[PDB]
Amino acid sequence: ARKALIEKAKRTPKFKVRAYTRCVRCGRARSVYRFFGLCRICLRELAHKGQLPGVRKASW
Amino acid sequence: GKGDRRTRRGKIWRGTYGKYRPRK
Amino acid sequence: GNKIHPIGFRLGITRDWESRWYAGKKQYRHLLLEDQRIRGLLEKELYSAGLARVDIERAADNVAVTVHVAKPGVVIGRGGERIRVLREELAKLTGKNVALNVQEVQNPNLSAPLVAQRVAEQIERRFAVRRAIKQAVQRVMESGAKGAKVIVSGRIGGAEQARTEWAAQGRVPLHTLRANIDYGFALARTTYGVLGVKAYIFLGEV
Amino acid sequence: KEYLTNERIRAKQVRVVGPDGKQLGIMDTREALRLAQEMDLDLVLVGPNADPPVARIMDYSKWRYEQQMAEKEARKTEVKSIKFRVKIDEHDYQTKLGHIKRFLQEGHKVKVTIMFRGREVAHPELGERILNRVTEDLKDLAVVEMKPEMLGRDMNMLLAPVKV
């Protein structure tokens, strides 16, 4: 999450097979969710906060 | 069986379709 | 090592979300980001006003920003000036109709994040950490809490070995869903390191 | 260790080696069996997976017993250490010597050590004086393979029995 590898938020690819999503809270690389654009830690944190609307603790 | 990508069951396992297992 | 977040456990029931807006697969992502930005910005600004619930709705893309605070005066300005500036900033950031419906938290010692923030502030001034914690707890108890807890971990007042000073009052029933506990947390941004200020206030059941 | 005895053979046509070592050829299984029965000693298949199934016509059980006995005898032969010190008590020395002699008689080696500390002055000399004397005492029983060699903190000898 180097503030230099927010060359992803730099919209330009060169080839649209380089656009690699990223988290958009820490800017992690490795556990984004298309549905949130968040890393699997950041997302979790926000879920616990209650700041991703409708995201409950799961149970069935 | 299972593993063999030139049977029916193998095909099923591998996920795909072709000569041995058609769409129809 | 255990112990999950109390709010993020009681979030289909006792306490509703700190954001409320539907959006599809196409737009939850952008909107979420926007909301996060808003929250960040407000935090940066209203640290003086003492901020708690930073509620938001997209009610047909009319952003509703609700900041439950400690000082309406400070948010507002000296009659109604700084409230406007903040709103404008939000608009600039987040280009949609944006409100800023300020509510004070009457009983500022029922809002647990506020309490936590206060404690953090005190710590930053380098006080007797344990003493401060105890005082905070007592204050909470006085307010009308049916139980309180403050966990403060870290380099206590500038210590070389990690500790976790720890104090409580009455009932802090951290397992029952029916409990309804305001959990607050404040990051004590201090001079020798970083101190964790976790605060739990048990206000009341059902 | 263990071969197919007379009728334990379906290995068709067999290499009829007696307990004597003599070849009667490639008899039937059955013929060989008959012969064994007549001769009293079992056609034991010491190489069923060979140029004719190696039909060694000895009593199997008897053979096994013999082998067992031999093995037992082999055990009973071993290394016996006698560790002196630099300073010697004479009675003790004598006793040690006697023990060594006994061991040699039995058939058992006597590795004759000393125990040295540091103090390596007349330590090696003392060791030499001891071990060599001991050897002189019991030449009839053992002669020395290993002389009184320095072990730094020991002086080792090996008295090995004269005849085997």
Next chain:
Amino acid sequence: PRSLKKGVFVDDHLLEKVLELNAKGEKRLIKTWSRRSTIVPEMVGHTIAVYNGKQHVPVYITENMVGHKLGEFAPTRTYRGH
């Protein structure tokens, strides 16, 4: 296993390098980083220094090795012996 639909892929560096040195007759080591490309009939006879991540390594080039990408002949990893 060979993997190009329609459009046998060669890079317009040493596509439009080596085709001009068709006019210059032969040429004298063509150094490339584009190992991606195949060995088209135009390359035949020349000498190509493909990139080994570190080396510009030479290949004298024949009519057999047409149906192959360049990085085949520049073996990048080294040794297996211990």
Next chain:
Amino acid sequence: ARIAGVEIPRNKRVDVALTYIYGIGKARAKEALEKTGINPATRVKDLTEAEVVRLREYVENTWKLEGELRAEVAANIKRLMDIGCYRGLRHRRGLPVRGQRTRTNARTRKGPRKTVAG
């Protein structure tokens, strides 16, 4: 009968018997039978010499099989080996080639197990 280069099998369903050709597997054999006009439910012991011979002819004239096929594969390897190609190099080594991680289970290219002290 010797339906390729001395390719005799015995006593099995025709297709299966054919499969014993170095040149042929379960699909080719099935195709071949369909082409030539021999019933799959028949045997090597139960086949008639006219119908034996048709198959023998067709198969031989249609594909490259057996010793020839072996030569071809060797030839291919040579083509790959002589030229300084990755695959050729791998072949020379005794290594796997096509996309295997070699670190552990390259064995059917490495043969049995040649353990070393650590």
Next chain:
Amino acid sequence: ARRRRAEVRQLQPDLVYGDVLVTAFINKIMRDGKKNLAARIFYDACKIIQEKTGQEPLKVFKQAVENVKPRMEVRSRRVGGANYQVPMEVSPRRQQSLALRWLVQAANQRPERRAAVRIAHELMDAAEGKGGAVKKKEDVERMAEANRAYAHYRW
């Protein structure tokens, strides 16, 4: 396992007769949870039995089971470093289960061709007083009787 005597499952009995033993046997035969295959197998076996020894295979099966049923066998308890084949009783249901298991084993030890067939043959052998399962049972009994010495080391 610690507290209670752990209840033994009551099944739906056979849908073709009304026999729990039969059901149990089928289950035992059944590997992988392929019952409506092993049920079929069982009925094929029964049919084979009928074809040969012309009694209602259910009774035959029962007889076979009875024949294989062991009454004393060997557990293993270490005592003084030595491990002992401790010859004790086998409890009724447990014994029955063991017998069933043995039968199944025998069926799959047999060199004959098909699923039903082997089982049928095994059952017939058991009824007779011979075969593989019965032999195993006998061996087990002997092991008890060869090691009746250690009996007193009861559990």
Next chain:
RNA sequence: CGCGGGGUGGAGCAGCCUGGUAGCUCGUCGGGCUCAUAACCCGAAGGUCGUCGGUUCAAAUCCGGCCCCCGCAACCA
């Protein structure tokens, strides 16, 4: 010089002896166990029997040479 006896997987030892049949322990490798090492258990690898050679249907085996090792008899040492 004599005579005697010996020679076996890396080390110590059986087999020869009874012509067919190479074990045993210590070590070397790998694994298991254990928190970890030792020990422990399991495997695996590893000997053509000094050699020339003969035998003989076939030898570690029977025979000799030569090489040695061993003790003693032995002069210059």
Next chain:
RNA sequence: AGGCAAGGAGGUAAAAAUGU
């Protein structure tokens, strides 16, 4: 016949070195 207790048996309680 069961209730225990006191005694007397006899069986079983195997082994298994260590440490920045």
Next chain:
RNA sequence: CCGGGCACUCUAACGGGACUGCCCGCGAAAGCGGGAGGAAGGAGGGGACGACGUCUGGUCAGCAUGGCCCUUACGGCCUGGGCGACACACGUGCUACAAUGCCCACUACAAAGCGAUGCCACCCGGCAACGGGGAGCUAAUCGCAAAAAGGUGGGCCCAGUUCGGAUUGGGGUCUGCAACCCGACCCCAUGAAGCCGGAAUCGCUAGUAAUCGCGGAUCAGCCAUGCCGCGGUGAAUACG
């Protein structure tokens, strides 16, 4: 299918229902054993939830920061390579060694997901991956999609084989600028070891082991046989 209907399934909100409440037994009491009605009985099942603290457990490479250190360099950009290297060793899997199986051929039954440049009906070209045309949906309403084991029939006949599919040759399909390193897949050929595995050792107490398929998330494409998740068939045994 349509009308027509909310009956039933459903779906989803809300309520009820199980409380040791009823009877007998013991027990001072709790409670326990047995009924009984009840869909369920004694915490019905499964979750979510993990105390004070330990392990100075793990992470400064998710982020947050204290201190230190680097600064035309330990920073920035890119191209290529490397992460995938392989005489070895272990870990976790998958697939197997067959005939309760294997191959084909028809035929039947799920849940839960997921779908917009996304899923793709259906039609044609192709052996086929797929390609072309092309409707539908914006999702219970169209689609992925056939679930498979199963059941009916055929075949195979106990072999290293129609077991098994590694590897290796060839030709292709797709995504993407680009599949050489290093993709998946199709087809044809190749047809390896392996005949249920030493000492050891792991998992599991009921809809569970075991086996069978289906979805997902990341994601162009995938090295997924992983992970998460759902249903199908479905046991054993527990003396102690």
